[PDB]
Symmetry: C4
Subunit: 80 residues, 4 copies
């Protein structure tokens, strides 16, 4: 209907575009160098430190592996 139902504060501008995994866990990268995993309800599931801003938007494989690039030249494959 357009009403907010939660925001989640990362550390920097979230330029990455978010992905939704087979279980509704939402994955997004932030300029704070972190890929965030938020449970569908708004509470963090985990965050993964890389070496630079995550402008890449996460891709999601069949087994649920999360694939995302980072300003630190690396393509990361992260277990769920």
């Amino acid at each position: 209907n357009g009403k907010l139902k939660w925001k989640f504060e990362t550390g920097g501008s979230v330029h990455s575009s978010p992905a939704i995994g087979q279980d509704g866990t939402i994955y997004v990268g932030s300029n704070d160098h972190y890929l965030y995993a938020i449970n569908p309800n708004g509470k963090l599931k985990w965050k993964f430190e890389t070496g630079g801003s995550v402008h890449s938007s996460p891709a999601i494989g069949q087994d649920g592996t999360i694939y995302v690039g980072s300003n630190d030249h690396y393509l990361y494959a992260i277990n769920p």
Copy 2:
């Protein structure tokens, strides 16, 4: 066929990439800080103020929740 069928003026450059929800409602974020929801025919459905330019591109969950990040460091989950 390539003919236009409507443009919709947001307030700033629309860098966000648009998403299409289970009902055809198209969701896009604009540098005017707004996530826009446009009914499939071109008339606004609603727009949601965040605190900065929305470069993130909206993700869309099973229940239709719209997930998008914003230059204001937050990941937003917005009801339809």
Copy 3:
């Protein structure tokens, strides 16, 4: 296998990310202000002038309508 099978010269850097329509027609926006439609084989189908660089990546609706934003503040809905 990794061999090229065609490039298509737009007028400026293609930052937009390409979309594939129900018939294989590939849609991408270019900084030359144009959304390009390329037939699956590499020959243009059409290109649609907007008022600025198309950094947005095209979305594709059920009927095949192409939805994309542009640096000119507008969200465009373009017939196939």
Copy 4:
């Protein structure tokens, strides 16, 4: 669970967003001008030189053709 399972060093910041092909091969473009293809396990499959940074995110056609744009004004269609 959030544990890493491999990073892959490209040559520059990976701004492109990665795509997953019908066989799990992950495709991403890097600012080093290369579109990378990584086998699902982390070892390269191949990398394709273009003429500029690949900010575009790869699209994937029915036959597995990889479609991506590049800062060198070209839209590339690359065999698997």
